[PDB]
């Protein structure tokens, strides 16, 4: 059994967007489906329910009249169409399969929906290198990017131990993020260490390689 959500992105307030769920590995027309969303601030919130028939639909009191849930049985696809989007609508949205008693056995990976007036902006990535002996700490600073999410990797992900990546914090419509990596002194600067940052929204792919510096 698999469920794959899609159709997420950045949306204007008062905008409309549609999400889809593709269901595989079970008899689809048999089951009811739900939409559930999560925000760090407000956590787990149910959105809407559609019966296998489509005859029965339930809507969250908050989304009523602005959101419509529908399905296409031949396709195996579940639909949520959103209109009149508000800031509170920003969430990660999961499609779920309804089981007896209405608990959810299977969940989707999720699509993130962000609704903001704020303009898309690419990050600038700065390597952080030690200042002027038994260990070394280095950092990547990624700042001035909107919206989430960014992906930070070290050495193509080849280097994953002693890594800390810190959640982004948003100030004045822009996000700041950082990462620190700790490797033994023999390891750096002898072998190469690089910061790879990916911003999907900007299509930005950037690499920063830490270099010791002095004048």
């Amino acid at each position: 059994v698999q469920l794959v959500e899609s159709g997420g992105g950045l949306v204007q307030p008062g905008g409309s967007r549609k999400l889809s769920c593709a269901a595989s590995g079970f008899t689809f027309r048999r089951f009811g489906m739900h939409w559930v969303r999560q925000s760090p601030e407000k956590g787990l919130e149910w959105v809407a329910y559609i019966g296998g028939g489509s005859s029965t639909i339930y809507y969250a009191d908050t989304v009523k009249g602005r959101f419509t849930i529908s399905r296409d049985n031949p396709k195996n696809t579940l639909f949520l169409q959103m209109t009149s989007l508000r800031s509170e609508d920003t969430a990660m949205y999961y499609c779920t399969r309804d089981e007896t008693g209405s608990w959810f056995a299977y969940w989707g990976q999720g699509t993130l929906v962000t609704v903001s007036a704020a303009k898309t902006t690419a990050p600038s990535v700065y390597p952080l290198a030690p200042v002027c002996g038994s260990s070394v700490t280095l950092g990547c600073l990624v700042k001035g990017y909107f919206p989430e999410p960014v992906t930070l990797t070290w050495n193509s992900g080849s280097l994953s131990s002693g890594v800390h990546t810190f959640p982004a914090v948003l100030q004045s419509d822009l996000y700041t993020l950082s990462s620190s990596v700790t490797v033994t002194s023999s390891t750096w600067p002898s072998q190469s260490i690089t910061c790879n940052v990916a911003h999907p929204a900007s299509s930005t792919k950037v690499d920063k390689k830490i270099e010791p510096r002095v004048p």
């Binding site: 956590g43 809507y59 209405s102 999720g110 200042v131 600073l141 982004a168 100030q171 950082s178």
Partner: protein, 213 residues
């Protein structure tokens, strides 16, 4: 219908018994539990109050009737650390969720390691200045950073971020950034990072002089 979960957060050492509470506004038709490990979707854990999902371990139990339901673990485990959510269906919308219980893993006190990073040459060329402090691998979680310029505390334009508990260490780390204009940054020579933690009465201090680097 309102589900109230207590405690909001708890710490359990390994080999400890832990119990969690969901409180219901009205008698519930169905009470379910889910487990979420952050950065992934919530997982099915318990359905219909007492029934284990295939693949959940024996230690977990689900209980309660009427208004009060409980989740307990026989013995705490490292892998167990997660957020737990209770959910209900009464046969009428809305279907409703708990605020959730965050279960931390208790461990020995640890002191942070502190690193201070001056602004990058590229950032300066760009016309801005940023200074970063890392506070790495400490316990327990609450911590303080103070910034000093030329001996004077600066509280303005500082952003702080926390990881969740580390996978191997079970520790926490925090990151601090001080943001200045280049011209302003060039006003002062010395930048200092002060970190205060329960482990030590005295703060741990790192600094550099704009001169020399």
């Amino acid at each position: 219908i309102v589900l109230s979960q207590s405690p909001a957060i708890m710490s359990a050492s390994p080999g400890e018994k832990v119990t969690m509470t969901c409180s219901a506004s009205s008698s519930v038709r169905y009470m379910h539990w889910y487990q979420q490990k952050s950065g992934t979707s919530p997982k099915r854990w318990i359905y219909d109050t007492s029934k284990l999902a295939s693949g959940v371990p024996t230690r977990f139990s689900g209980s309660g009737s009427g208004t009060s339901y409980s989740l307990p673990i026989s013995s705490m485990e490292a892998e167990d650390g997660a957020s737990y959510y209770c959910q209900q269906w009464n046969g009428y919308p809305p279907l409703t969720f708990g605020g959730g219980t965050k279960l931390e893993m208790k461990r020995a006190d640890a002191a942070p390691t502190v690193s201070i990073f001056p602004p990058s040459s590229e950032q300066l060329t760009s016309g801005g200045a940023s200074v970063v402090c890392f506070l790495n691998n400490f316990y327990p979680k609450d911590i303080n950073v103070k910034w000093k310029i030329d001996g004077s505390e600066r509280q303005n334009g500082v952003l702080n971020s926390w990881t969740d508990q580390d996978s191997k260490d079970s520790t926490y780390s925090m990151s601090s950034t001080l943001t200045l204009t280049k011209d302003e940054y060039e006003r002062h020579n010395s930048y200092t990072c002060e970190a205060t933690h329960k482990t030590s009465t005295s703060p741990i201090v790192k600094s550099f002089n704009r001169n020399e680097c």
